[PDB]
């Protein structure tokens, strides 16, 4: 009742969240940088740290 099971889904979701934190940090920097009015999300996020 004190030891619990984290199988495939929970573990991989944790790593996905770890990647998503770096993604959203990079998104925040890219937004605060200049020239907002011609950005698009594809040219904004990086699919590397996921």
């Amino acid at each position: 009742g004190n030891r619990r099971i984290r199988s495939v889904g929970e573990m991989a979701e944790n790593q996905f969240r770890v990647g998503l934190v770096r993604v959203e940090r990079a998104v925040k920097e890219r937004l605060s940088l200049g020239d907002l009015d011609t950005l698009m999300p594809q040219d904004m996020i990086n699919a590397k740290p996921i």
């Binding site: 925040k28 200049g34 020239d35 950005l39 594809q42």
Partner: protein, 1144 residues
Amino acid sequence: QYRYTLPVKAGEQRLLGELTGAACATLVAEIAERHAGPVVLIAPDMQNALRLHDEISQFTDQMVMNLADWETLPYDSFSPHQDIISSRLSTLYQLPTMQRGVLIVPVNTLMQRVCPHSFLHGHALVMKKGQRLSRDALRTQLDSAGYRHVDQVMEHGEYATRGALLDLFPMGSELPYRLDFFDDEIDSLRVFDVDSQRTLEEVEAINLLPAHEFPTDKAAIELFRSQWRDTFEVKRDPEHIYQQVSKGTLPAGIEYWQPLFFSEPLPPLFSYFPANTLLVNTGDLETSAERFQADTLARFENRGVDPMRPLLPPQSLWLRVDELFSELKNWPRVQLKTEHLPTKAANANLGFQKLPDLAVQAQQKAPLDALRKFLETFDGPVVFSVESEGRREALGELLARIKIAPQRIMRLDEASDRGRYLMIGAAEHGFVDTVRNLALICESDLLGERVARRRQDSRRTINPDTLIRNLAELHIGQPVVHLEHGVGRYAGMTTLEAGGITGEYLMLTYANDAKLYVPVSSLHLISRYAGGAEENAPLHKLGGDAWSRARQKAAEKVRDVAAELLDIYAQRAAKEGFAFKHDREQYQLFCDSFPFETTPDQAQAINAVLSDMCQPLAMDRLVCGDVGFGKTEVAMRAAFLAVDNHKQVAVLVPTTLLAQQHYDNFRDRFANWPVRIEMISRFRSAKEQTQILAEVAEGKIDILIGTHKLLQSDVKFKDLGLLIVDEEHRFGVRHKERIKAMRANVDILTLTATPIPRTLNMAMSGMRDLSIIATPPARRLAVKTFVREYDSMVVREAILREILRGGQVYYLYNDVENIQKAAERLAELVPEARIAIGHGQMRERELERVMNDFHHQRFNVLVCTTIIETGIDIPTANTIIIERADHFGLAQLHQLRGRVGRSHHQAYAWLLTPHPKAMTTDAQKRLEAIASLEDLGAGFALATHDLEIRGAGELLGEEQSGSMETIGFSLYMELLENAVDALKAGREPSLEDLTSQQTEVELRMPSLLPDDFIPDVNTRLSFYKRIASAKTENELEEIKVELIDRFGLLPDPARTLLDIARLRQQAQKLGIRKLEGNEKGGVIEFAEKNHVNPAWLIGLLQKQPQHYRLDGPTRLKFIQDLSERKTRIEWVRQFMRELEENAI
């Protein structure tokens, strides 16, 4: 006789009128000279005071001196930097008896209270030999000081007056001193022993001032505590200033708890004034005292929170404006105000009209029209008041253009009825003194204004093909034009959320199905289609394809750098250097023009540079020294040695503003020696560059300061003799070598503060010399670094602390698109400041104006990018505020921190960071490192820290900083020695020579011998030489077969190199002087005596109008679908052959 009478009575005023700009200066000079006693100039604000301290000193010679105020803000948290106090007390000790001169105080200091007597004539003694004072006067003043008459002075508070000699053992020091008054005068300062009474040293002037503004001994501490328990309440905490003082330490802002220490109210500073001053005003006081009182009250209530560290009322440390005007009815006063005062006694009008419209511009063929027409119609004299010394020459060769040669006068009343004179000072605006007919034309009245950015007609079209009236009726799929993004397809209404609002939007589908929603409140931004192609309409991509197409470029390593660098160094190590000639006295005069003293490490670097230049080898020296240590004067004292042998120095700086600053500084320093200095950059227009280059080539310009425009292959020096790279932690490599490549034996003097790792390792391995600079020059203080999360209150407090001191602020922002909004936000945050924007993407005649005005204090805060990262001086700027310091290198942060300081003022530097939930770990590591090393001489340690982490790049390639598997130095010296021996024996020309006469066949398609194909850099270089020197196709074929034998198959870059050299061989014989090629076509440039059939040429033009166009005397542009490089090659070869069969 004079114009008006000064007043001498209780508080009678004299209003003087009409005095326009920089005439307050001449009036106060006149007043200071005509008055038998002191003159106290009460400026309205510290800024103005500082300005006046430079202007007045130009028009007279009385000792004009400020009163060095605590540069803190009311109830601030910083100490007044003890040096300041050593000049804030000494003034006060002389103030009761100053017999002549001008003391300049703003009202920031005038309203303040100062030490109240006693403590000054008790805990101090300033006395120079020219103190005509008796024995018994000192006796009674030491009696009031409480000293005891002891014949054998041994401990503190003891004095003696025996015979003619007077002895003292002062409160401050542990040494007794013998005085020897003769005939109502002091005659000796004999440092005699505590007991032996034997003189150790005879001095002329003695200074024993307290090193704190308030008494610090035990009795005063007990008094402070008692007054504290009287007024405030003590809390038990080791940080409360009650316990801090009690434990003996003094807190940070302890000066603002001054009045507690004394138990007698602080005198209003007016008790310190002499018997008969004459307060000269400026502007207004019953308006600026009120503003300062309001700001002080605001600070008192702002910080009247924080039970820790509580505050006295402003009445207790500042005069109240009511008292201040109770006291300015106790001194005879003269007000200088710039407006027509009607008529009465105690009032007068001095006709001081403004100058006419004086301005110049290069637009008219006659630029000097305003002046040439003003200076004939002027019966009176004219004085030109140029700013610096060197600027005189920059104004002496401009008035030669209209035949006016100004004498130099010293005092303004040397002018005649009719003459042009110039004087050197710091005045800022002209005036036509129509009383005595004279005129003063300051240099800021020849550079009036800039009026560009007047645009072009139409940025919008209204009601044309598609009105866009749009009461929505549009169908679905109907093409539509958004004004900013182009054509899309309207795909219906929709409803959206946007973070708290539910709205209705229009639905537009661009390419790749990337949808754009536009609000219905702003549907007028949308127009209907116009091309008549409502079924054949295109579709743009939103946001462009900048991100997509940026990866199209590269990966061909189009040029091998190892061969070029090895050949450059090999040509370097072969040729014998130039051994300059050194003339002792003729360089002694250049040394004497230096208004400073060379610190014993700068004078060591200078001696090393000179004794290295005067050797038969070629210098290559790095002068790594911490920022602001005077590295530039090393460059000037080497530049003098160079150009005194007629040798064409060339200074290379990596930005335009630094180029402009160095141009001004070099004209200042070489302001008498006949060396013509010029600057080439993008500031200089194309009718100035095309003359500077002709001058250089003919060899008349003798120093050429330039940005990368210098190293652009059209700049041919006559006799280059010295190269001074400045701020070399830029430039890459090819820029540093592009000037060494044309002239090998040139001397390089590489100035930097944080050398980039490649050229720091390469200095630490003996390839270059290194001459560090330590011992910060005179009175520099390590800049205080603060790292905070960004905060509007922190920004406001920092800015006001700098501005109310009078200095200026760099507010580094580093984002060009948002810098306009950032400056607007800043100017709404701090209404008290004056703000301008500076960044290297303006029309450059705006950037000239901005950084000129900054140098002349015309605004305070400069919202700037990292264009100020490279050594902008501005010695008044004493606060940088780095907006987003988390993304900056250590070297970058150090150079930015080094912009402030530069003078005796303590200078703060803030590194604002975003809130730490979004800063990488490396960022906090960088920031804590750069905040740790807040000292002097930290630059070289930081550079050798940046190296060792970053690691030096290739020793024989580009890419200065990185591990990346270089070639070894131990291998490199052997490789270079092999190159040197083969070269000299062989005597082949450099590769650059084979580049020089090369008929350019830049077809921008890769052409080199690949590294794996011929690994030995030396042998590959030998093939480069023998190929480009092959002057027969048979020789080329012999090279081809030998290379096939020695290394097998020929890769594509190698065979293209062979074919391109073939085409060279052909085209040089033909008459094609420069041939091109690209994806879509190219241009062929013929020579003057070409072998091209012109009948065939017109035939090309007229049977193929879509392929051949002549644009220039020899420029034949061809356009073909050169989408395959092999097809490109066959096209150009076949073209030439078709020409050569018709060659004539």
